[PDB]
């Protein structure tokens, strides 16, 4: 009745969940295209909208509900299952239905999450260039205790070329890369020195607008696995700092190969949340 997306077992989320740690009472904001809050496998407690004309609890694109689903789709007898199924989900709409947003929508969205007490911030969005506003934004959210996790990018490797982008490029934000189910890197996964960890990314099946589920590809999909894993780490050890969580994710990761392609490795929430 309920589907267990290959990702959950691949990062050992099921192990920690069996320990009784499901991300409960941990606040998680998803800066995206909105969230089809009425979806039966999702529980959006609240959020804000920084895109004109669109509320925060609707997903005109689909990307948002998908990424929310990876982090916290309700542990029940329907749909899929999320990495941290008991987390407090927050929809922070910063991308419109085309999957585009402005530096100010995004900056406003981060500023809100930091103000409102979010523990983890997930950003499955990016761009070629950053901004002083965005950099200072993520720097504060991080310094204030938030775990900012961002997609690395989907530009492959152009040789020496660092295809990693903002917000992921910055050092207060964890840049996540995508591996398939065989634990191999994905052709689209951006490469660069600031690549931190690898989380499932190809063939990711999750919640999709209009009460259904779809399969997507992208580091957009890798990202919520880590935003998710940070939540299980925080529920189990709520006294940890963002740097302490970040370190556990990266330090216990399973080595796959060169960091310019894999960062420290594929993540392991069981060893991390140890
Ligand atoms: Na479910
Ligand atoms: Na980074």
UniProtKB/Swiss-Prot annotation:
Binding locations of Ca(2+) 2: 168, 170, 173
Cofactor(s) the record lists: Ca(2+)
Localization (cell): Secreted
Principal place of residence: secreted
Binding-site residues, Ca(2+) 1: 2, 41, 74, 76, 78, 80
Peptidase S8 domain sequence ranges: 5-273
Regulation: Inhibited by p-chlorophenyl and 1-naphthyl boronic acid derivatives.
Domain of life the protein comes from: Bacteria
Reactions performed catalytically: Hydrolysis of proteins with broad specificity for peptide bonds, and a preference for a large uncharged residue in P1. Hydrolyzes peptide amides
Technological use: Used as a detergent protease. Sold under the name Alcalase by Novozymes.
Keyword vocabulary terms for this entry: Calcium, Hydrolase, Metal-binding, Protease, Secreted, Serine protease, Signal, Zymogen
Active site, renumbered: 32 (charge relay system), 63 (charge relay system), 220 (charge relay system)
Cofactor: how and how many bound: Binds 2 calcium ions per subunit.
Role summary: Subtilisin is an extracellular alkaline serine protease, it catalyzes the hydrolysis of proteins and peptide amides. Shows high specificity for aromatic and hydrophobic amino acids in the P1 substrate position. May play an important role in the degradation of feather keratin.
Protein name: Subtilisin Carlsberg
Species per Swiss-Prot/TrEMBL record: Bacillus licheniformis
Parent-record interval covered: 106 to 379 of 379
């Amino acid at each position: 009745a309920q589907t267990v997306p290959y990702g959950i077992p691949l990062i050992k989320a099921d192990k920690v969940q069996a320990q009784g740690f499901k991300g409960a009472n941990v606040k998680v904001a998803v800066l995206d295209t909105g969230i089809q809050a009425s979806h039966p496998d999702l529980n959006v407690v609240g959020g804000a909208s920084f895109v004109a004309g669109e509320a925060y609890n609707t997903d005109g694109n689909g990307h948002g509900t998908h990424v929310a689903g990876t982090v916290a789709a309700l542990d029940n007898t329907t749909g899929v299952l999320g990495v941290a199924p008991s987390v407090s989900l927050y929809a922070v709409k910063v991308l419109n239905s085309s999957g585009s947003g402005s530096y100010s929508g995004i900056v406003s969205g981060i500023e809100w999450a930091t103000t409102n007490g979010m523990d983890v911030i997930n950003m499955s969005l990016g761009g070629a260039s950053g901004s002083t506003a965005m950099k200072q934004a993520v720097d504060n959210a991080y310094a204030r205790g938030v775990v900012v996790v961002a997609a690395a990018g989907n530009s492959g490797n152009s040789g020496s070329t660092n295809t990693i982008g903002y917000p992921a490029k910055y050092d207060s934000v964890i840049a996540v890369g995508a591996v398939d189910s065989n634990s191999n890197r994905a052709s689209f996964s951006s490469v660069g020195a600031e690549l931190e960890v690898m989380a499932p990314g190809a063939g990711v099946y999750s919640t999709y607008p209009t009460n259904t589920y779809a399969t997507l590809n992208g580091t957009s999909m890798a990202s919520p696995h880590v935003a998710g894993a940070a939540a299980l780490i925080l529920s189990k050890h709520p006294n940890l700092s963002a740097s302490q969580v970040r370190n556990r994710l990266s330090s216990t990761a399973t080595y796959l190969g060169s960091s310019f392609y894999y960062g420290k490795g594929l993540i392991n929430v069981e060893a991390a949340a140890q």
